[PDB]
Amino acid sequence: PKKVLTGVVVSDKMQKTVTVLVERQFPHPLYGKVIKRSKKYLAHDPEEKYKLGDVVEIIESRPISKRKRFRVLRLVESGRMDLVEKYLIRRQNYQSLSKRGGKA
Amino acid sequence: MVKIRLARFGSKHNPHYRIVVTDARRKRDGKYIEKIGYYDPRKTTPDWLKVDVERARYWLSVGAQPTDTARRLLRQAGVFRQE
Amino acid sequence: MLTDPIADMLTRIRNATRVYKESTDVPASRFKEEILRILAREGFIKGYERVDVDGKPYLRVYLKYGPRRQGPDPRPEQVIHHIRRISKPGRRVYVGVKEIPRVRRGLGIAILSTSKGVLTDREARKLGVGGELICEVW
Amino acid sequence: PTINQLVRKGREKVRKKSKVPALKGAPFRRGVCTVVRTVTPKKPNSALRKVAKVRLTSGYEVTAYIPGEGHNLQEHSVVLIRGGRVKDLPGVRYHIVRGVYDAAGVKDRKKSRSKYGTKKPKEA
Amino acid sequence: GRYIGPVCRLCRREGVKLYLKGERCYSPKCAMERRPYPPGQHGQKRARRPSDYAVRLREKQKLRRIYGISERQFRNLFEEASKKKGVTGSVFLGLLESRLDNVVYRLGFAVSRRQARQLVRHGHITVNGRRVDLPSYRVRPGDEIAVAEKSRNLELIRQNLEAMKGRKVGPWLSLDVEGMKGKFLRLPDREDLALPVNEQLVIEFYSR
RNA sequence: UGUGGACCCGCCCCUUGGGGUGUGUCCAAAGGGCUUUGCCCGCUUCCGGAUGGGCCCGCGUCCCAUCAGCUAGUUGGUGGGGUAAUGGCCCACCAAGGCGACGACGGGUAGCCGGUCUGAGAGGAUGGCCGGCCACAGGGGCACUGAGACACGGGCCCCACUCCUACGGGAGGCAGCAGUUAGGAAUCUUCCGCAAUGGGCGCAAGCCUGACGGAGCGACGCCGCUUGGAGGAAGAAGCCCUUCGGGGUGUAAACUCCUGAACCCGGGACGAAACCCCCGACGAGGGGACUGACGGUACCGGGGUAAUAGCGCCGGCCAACUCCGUGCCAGCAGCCGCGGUAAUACGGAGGGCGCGAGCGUUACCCGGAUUCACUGGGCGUAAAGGGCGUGUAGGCGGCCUGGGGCGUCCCAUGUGAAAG
Ligand SMILES: [Mg+2]
Ligand SMILES: [Mg+2]
Ligand SMILES: [Mg+2]
Ligand SMILES: [Mg+2]
Ligand SMILES: [Mg+2]
Ligand SMILES: [Mg+2]
Ligand SMILES: [Mg+2]
Ligand SMILES: [Mg+2]
Ligand SMILES: [Mg+2]
Ligand SMILES: [Mg+2]
Ligand SMILES: [Mg+2]
Ligand SMILES: [Mg+2]
Ligand SMILES: [Mg+2]
Ligand SMILES: [Mg+2]
Ligand SMILES: [Mg+2]
Ligand SMILES: [Mg+2]
Ligand SMILES: [Mg+2]
Ligand SMILES: [Mg+2]
Ligand SMILES: [Mg+2]
Ligand SMILES: [Mg+2]
Ligand SMILES: [Mg+2]
Ligand SMILES: [Mg+2]
Ligand SMILES: [Mg+2]
Ligand SMILES: [Mg+2]
Ligand SMILES: [Mg+2]
Ligand SMILES: [Mg+2]
Ligand SMILES: [Mg+2]
Ligand SMILES: [Mg+2]
Ligand SMILES: [Mg+2]
Ligand SMILES: [Mg+2]
Ligand SMILES: [Mg+2]
Ligand SMILES: [Mg+2]
Ligand SMILES: [Mg+2]
Ligand SMILES: [Mg+2]
Ligand SMILES: [Mg+2]
Ligand SMILES: [Mg+2]
Ligand SMILES: [Mg+2]
Ligand SMILES: [Mg+2]
Ligand SMILES: [Mg+2]
Ligand SMILES: [Mg+2]
Ligand SMILES: [Mg+2]
Ligand SMILES: [Mg+2]
Ligand SMILES: [Mg+2]
Ligand SMILES: [Mg+2]
Ligand SMILES: [Mg+2]
Ligand SMILES: [Zn+2]
Structure with a gap:
């Protein structure tokens, strides 16, 4: 079966492509506690239909470009920028960790 | 093509072949598609040839070619007996 | 706020028994309750009960120990x-x-x-x- | 540490330091004597210990010890070495195999002959 | 046989008669009678508390010298009996006791195992009427161990089965004195073996 | 010629480029052999199968954060090129994206796996024979031919190296089998055979096959086997102790009898029955003929000789003690430690212990080591609480009810090749 993943659109910044963030809980091999971990998929949105913060199912599919091998299947749950802002702060923090620091 | 033939499996001076179906291009003792029988040419035990004529015939029915002895062994375990 | 309330109960118990109390209150929850039910069945506790220490609901757990022993230090054997x-x-x-x-x-x-x-x-x-x-x- | 800590960092596997850089891993290495010296031992032991600064095929100049009653090594003796602390002489970490190349088997030995490399004495 | 060498010095070291030579070990001449101390210079000096380790060593040697097996040969037998299903102490004995060399000894074809090891390497012995010239061949139950038709009368085997007329042979073996046949009926049980050795100790030694 | 197939447009079902359909266009072929009208081997197109492959995706896959930022074909879009096929694979134009503390980028190391060693296990270590995949063929690029290659024993070019050279110009590529040389502690025959198994071509006869089947060398490993067996003194001789009475090596030896490795003689294999040919129909089936490198080996039978034993250890850990010699020397030593004139620790001897065609050493891996602790550890003084706060991400989260069912649990099922 073509793998189907469910995630959150965190990018509209391209044409006919949305970036989906897909989490996955699983117990850790050695230490056992259940760890989150998540990966961004570039997904194909030909209609620029899905918006920033939509929750979408994504489907394994024939290549559309480098990076793009999934197309956006159905809409699951409409808007929610909580997950986005979450992901947004995550990336913003990167500003601090380097050789310098201050007021981000 | 794809062959029915013997693969060597005994030891030095102690030969036992496996009657196997394989792409003719593998090494003789390499990964095969399917074993369908075995063969001790020394007749050391009373059970020294075994085949399974159903699979033997299946493969034939899709034009696996037997070797000049696989066909020989096959025959002897009545693969080709049609009466 | 208790981080793990199942463990706080398993403990409350353990602490009580170790000084041979009669019984002990653990704050109420179906789950905690669901557990003590088993402790009773298998005989680790005499019983539990839904008392009510000042307005909010607790579970009075009643403890069970051994008989008194002879020797220096009589303290009975724990059942738990x-x-x-x-x-x-x-x-x-x-x-x-x-x-x-x-x-x-x-x-x-x-x-x-x-x-x-x-x-x-x-x-x-x-x-x-x-x-x-x-x-x-x- | 917390489970979560052991998740973030981990444990840390250990590392073996070779008590003998006879390179290549190898069980023996050939070399050439450049100094046959004598060394004073330590702590609570006095004597005159036989030693040889040896230039190895492994491109290593290391000091190796010369076991046995007495030797025959000179400042150009090709020699085969083999690893072994001499407890007393600090910084002496290999032995010279006795009976290989220029170094000769200990003469007139009857007891532990394979160490010291001396042939079975004849009898008829 | 194997080992090869003064044997009664072993009788002496283990402090027990081991009977590594048939006749004579029933005479008043086995050294253990009127010389029962260890061999060598310090034989007659008093002893010291042998270590835990020491005890397990000798107890092994005692067993292992009784059969004249090597040790790489012995260790393998014990290792197999270890892996094997069932109680490993008793099973080990059964494997030792199933060796053709010793089965021949037991049936009194030979007066001892050393001699039995010869009778075998020299093909005087048949198993299921076919010559087996291997002292460590494993006799399974049902097998019939005979004296070889054309051996069946050397000065030695004649005189040796002559004594076997009217002597009793182990519960787990039946012997025929006439046709010089003989059978392995069942793997001997631990109790059957009256071995001068605590096979348990032996197990401790190999698990050091 | 159009069975059929390809392509453009339209309609139909399907749902990504799947399957049908109607015009229009476009596309086939090879001959050979005969015991010659009748079969054998080939050819063409299409559909289907079998095998083998391409590509794409989820998850997994070492160390350094004393590498923290990275990217411009970069990230996406449209159109085209290319391919068997998707795709920034390549190209033009447009948009300004993409990745990173869940470790990007960089640096180091490394073929991966089935498996192997260890471990009670969880783990740790490894990827050597064998089998699977990958990558490579003196170093670097590149295409051509073809079902397939960017092609080890095909082509082109540049580079480094060797050899021929008439000075212009050529020829090579053992990481195929043997073999030589160099390096190294160290690693084999320039062997026999296509008899078997397998491969290529051939209608077959057959040909080719350093694949392969065997032999050779090396105690390198595993297993098996021998150097004898039974008798034999109050107990030789020599050697060693001693309280001078003795005690030890020691049933050991001698010697008596018995068996008979080696060695000689004779018989002598299995692996091989197919291809082929005859009858039947060139099918099923039956009949016959040929063929063995290993090898006069294995195995059998007759004859027959008492016929190699080493190596390490003996203070404690750790099985095994006595004399002499040496004098903080000579030396031993895995760790503790021995030797300074009575050394069971050094060297010899007698004796003893352990293994035994091997015994030791060195090297390395796991173990013991709960000594990186998930199982399974710690931080007042043993090493370990951050100088203190505020707070980001992250981790964690009271009581009651309902929905979902992501974790979790259960059943059925597919997969988990062979070898191990
Ligand atoms: Mg020594
Ligand atoms: Mg047409
Ligand atoms: Mg469509
Ligand atoms: Mg169509
Ligand atoms: Mg049409
Ligand atoms: Mg035409
Ligand atoms: Mg014709
Ligand atoms: Mg296919
Ligand atoms: Mg651009
Ligand atoms: Mg494009
Ligand atoms: Mg940017
Ligand atoms: Mg590499
Ligand atoms: Mg462990
Ligand atoms: Mg490999
Ligand atoms: Mg090269
Ligand atoms: Mg070549
Ligand atoms: Mg050449
Ligand atoms: Mg060299
Ligand atoms: Mg051939
Ligand atoms: Mg062939
Ligand atoms: Mg004797
Ligand atoms: Mg004779
Ligand atoms: Mg004979
Ligand atoms: Mg032929
Ligand atoms: Mg005919
Ligand atoms: Mg026939
Ligand atoms: Mg003799
Ligand atoms: Mg001791
Ligand atoms: Mg001196
Ligand atoms: Mg060591
Ligand atoms: Mg002295
Ligand atoms: Mg002194
Ligand atoms: Mg001494
Ligand atoms: Mg010592
Ligand atoms: Mg550990
Ligand atoms: Mg600790
Ligand atoms: Mg401190
Ligand atoms: Mg503080
Ligand atoms: Mg401080
Ligand atoms: Mg927070
Ligand atoms: Mg909760
Ligand atoms: Mg939460
Ligand atoms: Mg619910
Ligand atoms: Mg679920
Ligand atoms: Mg398997
Ligand atoms: Zn005796």
């Missing part, structure tokens, strides 16, 4: 010698029905929550289920 949390928050511990613990060669229980309810090690073995290994008691 040992009672420990197996699965804790930030390290959950689930076992399949094939790997449910044999506790003390069975002179003791292990309590696991399953989709068929809170059960003992032998209870889940019959029913043919695993779940979340909550604690061993023996």
Whole structure:
């Protein structure tokens, strides 16, 4: 079966492509506690239909470009920028960790 | 093509072949598609040839070619007996 | 705010027994309740009860010990010698029905929550289920 | 440390330091004597110990010890070495195999002959 | 046979008669009678508390010298009996006791195992009427161990089965004195073996 | 010629480029042999199968954060090129994206796996024979031919190296089998055979095959086997102790009898029955003929000789003690430690212990080591609480009810090749 993943659109910044963030809980091999971990998929949105913060199912599919091998299947749950802002702060923090620091 | 033939499996001076179906291009003792029988040419035990004529015939029915002895062994375990 | 309330209860108990109290209040929750039910069945506690210490609901647990002994230090033998949390928050511990613990060669229980309810090690073995290994008691 | 800590960092596997850089891993290494010296031992032991600064095929100049009653090594003796602390002489970490190349088997030995490399004495 | 060398010095070291030579070990001439101390210079000096380790060593040697097996040969037998299903102490004995060399000894074809090891390497012995010239061949139960038709009368085997007329042979073996046949009926049980050795100790030694 | 197939447009079902359909266009072929009208071997197109492959995706896959920022075909879009096929694979134009503390980028190391060693296990270590995949063929690029290659024993070019050279110009590529040389502690025959198994071509006869089947060398490993067996003194001789009475090596030896490795003689294999040919029909089936490198080996039978034993250890750990010699020397030593004139620790001897065609040493891996602790550890003084706060991400989260069912649990099922 073509793998189907469910995630959150965190990018509209391209044409006919949305970036989906897909989490996955699983117990850790050695230490056992259940760890989150998540990966961004570039997904194909030909209609620029899905918006920033939509929750979408994504489907394994024939290549559309480098990076793009999934197309956006159905809409699951409409808007929610909580997950986005979450992901947004995550990336913003990167500003601090380097050789310098201050007021981000 | 794809062959029915013997693969060597005994030891030095102690030969036992496996009657196997394989792409003719593998090494003789390499990964095969399917074993369908075995063969001790020394007749050391009373059970020294075994085949399974159903699979033997299946493969034939899709034009696996037997070797000049696989066909020989096959025959002897009545693969080709049609009466 | 108690981080793990199942463990606070397993402990409250352990602390009470170790100084031979009569009974002890643990704040109420169906789940805690669901557990004590088992402790009773297997005889580790005389019983539990839904008392009400000032407005909010507790579970009076009544403890059971041994008889008095002879020698220096008479203090009776605990019926609950040992009672420990197996699965804790930030390290959950689930076992399949094939790997449910044999506790003390069975002179003791292990309590696991399953989709068929809170059960003992032998209870889940019959029913043919695993779940979340909550604690061993023996 | 917390489980979560052991998740973030981990444990840390250990590392073996070779008590003998006879390179290549090898069980023996050939070399050439550049100094046959004598060394004073330590702590609670006095004597005159036989030693040889040896230039190895492994491109290593190391000091190796010369076991046995007495030797025959000179400042150009090709020699085969083999690893072994001499407890007393600190910084002496290999032995010279006796009976290989220029170094000769200990003469007139009857007891532990394979160490010291001396042939079975004849009898008829 | 194997080992090869003064044997009664072993009788002496283990402090027990081991009977590594048939005749004579029933005479008043085995050294253990009227010389029962260890061999060598310090034989007659008093002893010291042998270590835990020491005890397990000798107890092994005692067993292992009784059969004249090597040790790589012996260790393999014990290792197999270890892996093997069932109680490893008793099973080990059964494997030792199933060796053709010793089965020949037991049936009194030979007066001792050393001699029995010869009778075998020299093909005087048949198993199921076919010559087996291997002292460590394993006799399974049902097998019939005979003297070889054309051996069946050397000065030695004649005189040796002559004594076997009217002597009793172990519960787990039946012997025929006439046709010089003989059978392995069942793997001997631990109790059957009256071995001067605590086979348990032996197990401790190999698990050091 | 159009069975059929390809392509453009339209309609139909399907749902990504799947399957049908109607015009229009476009596309086939090879001959050979005969015991010659009748079969054998070939050819063409299409559909289907079998095998073998391409590509794409989820998850897994070492160390350094004393590498923290990275990217411009970069990230996406449209159109085209290319391919068997998707795709920034390549190209033009447009948009300004993409990745990173869940470790990007960089640096180091490394073929991966089935498996192997160890471990009670969880783990740790490894990827050597064998089998699977990958990558490579003196170093670097590149295409051509073809079902397939960017092609080890095909082509082109540049580079480094060797050899021929008439000075212009050529020829090579053992990481195929043997073999030589160099390096190294160290690693084999320039062997026999296509008899078997397998491969290529051939209608077959057959040809080719350093694949392969065997032999050779090396105690390198595993297993098996011998150097004898039974008798034999109050107990030789020599050697060694001693309280000078003795005690030890020691049933050991001698010697008596018995068996008979080696060695000689004779018989002598299995692996091989197919291809082929005859009858039947060139099918099923039956009949016959040929063929063995190993090898006069294995195995059998007759004859027959008492016929190699080493190596390490003996203070404690650790099985095994006595004399002499040496004098903080000579030396031993895995760790503790021995030797300074009575050394069971050095060297010899007698004796003893352990293994035994091997015994030791060195090297390395796991173990013991709960000594990186998930199982399974710690931080007042043993090493370990951050000088203190505020707070980001992250981790964690009271009581009651309901929905979902992501974790978790259960059943059925597919997969988990062979070898191990
Ligand atoms: Mg020594
Ligand atoms: Mg047409
Ligand atoms: Mg369509
Ligand atoms: Mg169409
Ligand atoms: Mg048409
Ligand atoms: Mg035409
Ligand atoms: Mg014609
Ligand atoms: Mg296919
Ligand atoms: Mg651009
Ligand atoms: Mg494009
Ligand atoms: Mg940028
Ligand atoms: Mg490499
Ligand atoms: Mg462990
Ligand atoms: Mg490999
Ligand atoms: Mg080269
Ligand atoms: Mg070549
Ligand atoms: Mg050449
Ligand atoms: Mg060299
Ligand atoms: Mg051939
Ligand atoms: Mg062939
Ligand atoms: Mg004798
Ligand atoms: Mg004779
Ligand atoms: Mg004879
Ligand atoms: Mg032929
Ligand atoms: Mg005919
Ligand atoms: Mg026929
Ligand atoms: Mg003799
Ligand atoms: Mg001792
Ligand atoms: Mg001196
Ligand atoms: Mg060492
Ligand atoms: Mg002295
Ligand atoms: Mg002194
Ligand atoms: Mg000494
Ligand atoms: Mg010592
Ligand atoms: Mg460990
Ligand atoms: Mg500690
Ligand atoms: Mg401190
Ligand atoms: Mg503080
Ligand atoms: Mg401080
Ligand atoms: Mg927070
Ligand atoms: Mg909660
Ligand atoms: Mg939460
Ligand atoms: Mg619910
Ligand atoms: Mg679920
Ligand atoms: Mg398998
Ligand atoms: Zn005796």
